[PDB]
Amino acid sequence: MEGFERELDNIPDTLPDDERLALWKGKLKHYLILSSAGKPIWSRHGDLSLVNSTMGVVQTIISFYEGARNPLLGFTAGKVRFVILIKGPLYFVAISRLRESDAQLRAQLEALYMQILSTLTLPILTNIFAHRPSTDLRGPLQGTESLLASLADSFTKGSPSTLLSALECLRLRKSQRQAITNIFLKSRCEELLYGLLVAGGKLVSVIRPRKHSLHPSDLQLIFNMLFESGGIKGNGGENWIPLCLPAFNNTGYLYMYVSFLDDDLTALILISPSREAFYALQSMRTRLVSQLLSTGYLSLIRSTALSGRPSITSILPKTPLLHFLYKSRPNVQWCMSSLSSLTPPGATATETLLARRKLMSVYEELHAALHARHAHLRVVYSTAEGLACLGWSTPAFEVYCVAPGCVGRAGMAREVNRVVQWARREEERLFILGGGV
Template structure:
């Protein structure tokens, strides 16, 4: 007899066999493939009555033998399912034994379920559907009593280093009445030419390419950064402004412990006063009960609170970020305030007058706070990974640039940096001191996002507190900008991509000193560095690298199904990524991509989770997170990419990073 059709579905390393109501069974092999086999068709009545093979001949009684009508018993009927098929001879007939056709046909349930896999420290592993994209069939199955039963199995291989050492799966134990999304008839192999053409193009579907009319979470994200007009003196437009205020996906608020408003990303003081009062009351109530309020959810909006001395910071988000991610963003806003005032000044102001209005000391810095907040709202890989991105250069070329900085160094120099296109090119620093990524984030925000420094043009001398280095005093930063394009190059020839700005075209020389009167010495050092870089050709190399931009995933791994990735080197606190183009071209696609990375990052860094590998499947993308002591890796592919193809692409990217490590990362830098 021929075997019945089989339906396979990916699972885990554990072997699971459970019968269903019709006697079917499912089994997972060691390679993580679960095979669900439909039971064999019932044999005919003659086959059931026939004797078994071997020695099971029919026994005749003595009376039958003495009877004149005695006939010898028939030979045992062979079991056709175990009889090997005879080879055909030339000119012979190949008569295949077929069973009678049955009325019932094998069926297979097909449901669109988003599966995620989790590994736990005790050796267990779980696969579960994501709540965000739960299918209709899954909901029906889970609502049916006894339809799904959690099963926990231990790994059979016993390898402690395996990334998939445990499993928790949901296996069907009863035949559900409403969990079949579709039935496949016996014409499963009969595919039309149109279907075959569509199947050949399945792997080329990109993430978020399908239009999901049900998903309206980011429908008006393009209007997120439109400014809200101030409330007029008569308050006639307040209702309209409140509607615009509530339509924003993200808000950042800062207030004092006395309830004085300090900063709001959207809306003026007259518009937010009511909200400030409510928030201050909630925080004070929980503080009085010695149970500080860290966050709460209202509808689909998450409120996260960060308290820093006399200041209260609140993030209000509908973008699905975790509490830890929102809290780190609030800490960055606090660091931005400290970079202007320093911690002793801030403490002194509120110790003398708890109801101090901090808006006057911070006057003029609202642009810095807003640009930093907008960076978080758009989605920042640097903020997510707490790491820096470097400009890709050859090791020998970076070595020449480092030596140029060291030779031109003055005695009053503390740090020297060259930044191009928002990426670090070279850094010169003391042997036992290094700049914290949060400090560099503040510097990059001031130089490339806010625009106030570049608007001044020429040279800038800026007093600045770097809280990660020393939050009690000021350093002094000399800044000079150069264009990445030749003066004679036409502006129309410059590449323009959505999301890119003048930041991508600028080269900045930053020289930091602890001496307030060191402006002229640092200016002379800047002139010497630029002159030497132009002589040895390094400046042209930097400009060419900026104009070239980031490579695409296809340039890094030809033929890969990966569309984007993030790779963070833990030891160097740096990351690398390909270009957003052409798959994530624009503000909205990049925000959706960062939402995906935020979810992966939150799950793999959850407080009680020790995940190594996380594979996530949703309706519009397939993604992978991989965390080791050496690196963190996140990647995304189209919804039809298989787990094998995305794992293969991830391994290829890891190999590429290892080969190019001294090009994409600054290892050591120039030290004096």
């Protein structure tokens, strides 16, 4: 709220040098991925000319700490926080003026590392940086830079999925979701390993075999690379992306087939351990798609995705809450109320973006309060007219809520219990309890 409107606006290259440097320093958040050699691998804001000396400084500081056998995990400078992650040859540093915790910035840097490792498998990365530490990774990362930039933009905008390390799901009936999963099973192929149906970035259905299990890290990686980044639209149509899925197998290449269900943007993802399966997976999709319109489930999916997150009044009749964010510790999945209630009905992109950023920053402050290291906090209430907020971290779930300041803890606890009760009532209709057969 201190210049966030132009924070996502990139630094123009036509400006002279010192104005560009001042603009770069004025950015609220910076993501800097580099090698152990200090070479600029990727920067969210500004080209490598702008960030080159700064990245060298960061690398030599971390290398100072590595030489002292005491790895550096980050440091604070007033309101600014620098978080440093060392994933082998790769050094990730996040500079935040938005007051996030070390854990949240570390999770965001871990997500960036996850995307990079998905681009090229871990043994290949380690070998290319070991047998040649003087390696510029920007070569193989030619197509990955746009995805990383968009993912970092989503992080700055406020990513609840990354904050909670979970995923969102369509509010589908349990019978309807079971029918969709059974339709998914009725068209299955031996080469198919991980089936996935998503609608508007929200999980719809998951298909996994008995032996191999779909780790939540893999799902987070897929959603970050496709829906959080929004790069799935790029090269629209059939999309045969080689993949890594390091949680499943980081030493090998899977292959994910992405298709648009336009026959809001419903997507079908099919991950197979063989490169030649694509055509067969194509025959899979036409088999699945034809089943969906015939049974009408595709139209239902599109209609459910078209309506966004349910409004706070509809979820809780006559509630003082403006928004909430409920995460279930099992099933690793979350849900939230519509963001349209925060902003006035007639608003521009900048106003809605500012409202989302404010609410998300409140949520990350609450999340940091709950998950402070060596602090067994269970409930946290704050008053940032004002704006009251509560966060509850029962070992079975995790709920954050925001209301106008004229509510108080007494009523806010009642509202939090109410929304938790609603989520428990609709647990089967909100979360993927189990995968496919």
